Amino acid sequence: MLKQVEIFTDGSCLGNPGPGGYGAILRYRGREKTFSAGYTRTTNNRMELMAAIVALEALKEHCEVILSTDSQYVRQGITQWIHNWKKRGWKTADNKPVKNVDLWQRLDAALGQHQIKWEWVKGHAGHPENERCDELARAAAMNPTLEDTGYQVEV
């Protein structure tokens, strides 16, 4: 039985905007849970955030987590933007709501319930679970069933 929760995520999109999906693998309690869903009209960045969101929201108590992903967008947000956005009330320097504020706020909320260790893998050198995520994200994008409500050409 692992002593740390392990999470792997990937997101994919055929266009901008386009049909997209995510894949996430969660090792929790004594199981391996797999999540995957495709959205009719979304972006790659929104799917990459969605992957992390869904995996974290499955956690029902405060856990010690290790999350592994090759997502540049998630890494950038986590390491350079988030901190400064919370100080600013989630606005850009020209005073508008940040891009994908809906998902970043949602993620932030899930983050605050746990002790997280982030592992930034390179696309060509991730574990077997990251490749698997990529395959599920891609398959999902080919057969989308949900609507990405928070997507805006806009804000």
Side-chain angles (χ1 to χ4, degrees):
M1 184 147 296
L2 277 187
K3 301 309 302 177
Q4 227 131 87
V5 164
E6 300 186 331
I7 303 173
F8 314 79
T9 65
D10 205 345
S12 197
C13 202
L14 304 186
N16 187 40
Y22 78 73
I25 291 164
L26 163 69
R27 280 196 261 280
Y28 180 48
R29 297 298 280 283
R31 330 208 158 151
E32 183 167 283
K33 279 149 188 142
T34 311
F35 304 87
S36 193
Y39 294 75
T40 87
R41 187 172 185 261
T42 186
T43 71
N44 204 113
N45 295 167
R46 289 181 62 82
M47 294 291 103
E48 292 167 3
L49 270 176
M50 193 72 80
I53 294 169
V54 176
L56 292 168
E57 288 187 353
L59 300 172
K60 291 274 100 178
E61 71 263 356
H62 312 288
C63 311
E64 308 183 9
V65 181
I66 172 182
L67 195 164
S68 168
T69 189
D70 74 356
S71 168
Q72 185 204 240
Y73 179 81
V74 161
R75 175 194 195 199
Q76 264 198 286
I78 298 295
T79 69
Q80 311 153 1
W81 312 331
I82 254 211
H83 196 77
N84 314 276
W85 285 337
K86 288 150 93 71
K87 274 288 201 210
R88 280 203 285 204
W90 295 97
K91 272 141 189 175
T92 67
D94 66 356
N95 212 108
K96 286 185 85 33
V98 314
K99 199 210 281 144
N100 303 320
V101 60
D102 72 309
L103 295 190
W104 279 117
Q105 281 186 171
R106 192 161 165 190
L107 180 64
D108 171 69
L111 287 186
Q113 292 287 110
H114 306 102
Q115 320 170 46
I116 320 217
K117 181 192 317 160
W118 292 96
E119 178 200 46
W120 310 126
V121 301
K122 279 261 174 197
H124 67 283
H127 309 289
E129 300 76 347
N130 304 89
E131 313 181 49
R132 208 170 127 212
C133 285
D134 180 44
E135 277 179 75
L136 291 152
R138 290 192 291 93
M142 306 288 297
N143 181 234
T145 57
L146 309 183
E147 184 168 10
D148 178 4
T149 285
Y151 170 79
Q152 304 154 186
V153 179
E154 300 87 74
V155 203

